[PDB]
Write a protein that binds this ligand. Sequence first.
Ligand code: HEM
Length: 390
Amino acid sequence: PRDFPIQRGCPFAAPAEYAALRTDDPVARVTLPTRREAWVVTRYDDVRELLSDPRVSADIRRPGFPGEQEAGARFRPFIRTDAPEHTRYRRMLLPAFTVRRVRAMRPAVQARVDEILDGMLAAGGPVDLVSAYANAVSTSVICELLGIPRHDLEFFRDVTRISGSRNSTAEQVSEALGGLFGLLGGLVAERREEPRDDLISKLVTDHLVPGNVTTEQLLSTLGITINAGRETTTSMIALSTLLLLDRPELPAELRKDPDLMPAAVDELLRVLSVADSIPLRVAAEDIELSGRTVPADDGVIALLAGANHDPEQFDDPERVDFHRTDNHHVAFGYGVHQCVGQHLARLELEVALETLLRRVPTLRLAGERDQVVVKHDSATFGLEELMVTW
Ligand code: HEM
């Protein structure tokens, strides 16, 4: 008779009903919208170790929910394989990802956010954020990641808009795809020749051209790569914003001394924890966890939020306090699955929020609390429309 909660309490996030299911059914049973039964974990350490158990992988029956489906045995998406197929992709790509690398694009991520703003304020209007800033950056961040060039960014921003979201036609969606990959291969072939030092560059030269880089396979992952970031951060940005945006104290601290958003972005990431439902893992075996053991071959997701607001982790978890000692959160992943992406997802996230309140201080909502609208369509969380001016 059981369900998994939207909730989201709204305001801000996210625990919903979980307070009860955190203290008590620490592993309670709950139906998925597909009415397949499965298991759900809500206590910080439960959520984490559970996550990096030896025996927990992704694959065939019976995980997640998307109507549909344990089908397909869609190949790849390697973000739902266990090892040794999944690892050889994950690692195929880490060396690129890293930090020494990620803090490097510090000037180009800055650059880009700045140039996108240049227009924000130039076409003026009381405009929607999510669509306008929020997405804009996100994509373009990832452009800067994959070496995507000059301003064939709308060559790009477009097959994103189309391909990804709401309504097609299937053919004319499938047509979007056509470009994205005309684009990619464009590049995939181009960096074989004059290889720059970006993500196609990394994947092509080191791995591709001499390894099990099979140009079937690249585009695949480059696919799975863009799909990491467009929706998930855009999410974390425009929500993070709306938080700040309606609770002035928060900008406050962040202005007295702007050496914060780092701590802030970690803190928001935790507290917003929009990444909630990680995959879901089928339990490889029976597994002890606060003793209630999870049956061999069952569905078990790990609620990132539930865990992110567990007091066993850190005191007073609702409070968006920025000067916490202790916030080894995991709005990102835990264990060999964890968000490879997140080093970006931080520069994405600070340069984005940072500047919003540098260059455009107190913009405000065009809309009203009572017509702001939160997306809920993917499990990764976000907002449909956010409406502002300055
Ligand atoms: C702030 C926004 C983001 C959030 C909240 C987020 C959250 C997460 C979480 C919780 C996971 C766990 C996956 C698992 O269960 O193993 C994950 C996986 C992953 N993320 Fe992100 N992510 C964000 C941005 C990004 C971006 C922009 C990228 C790159 C485009 C990225 C790359 C990845 C990859 C490659 C995986 C799968 C790793 C693997 O299983 O090999 N992330 N993400």
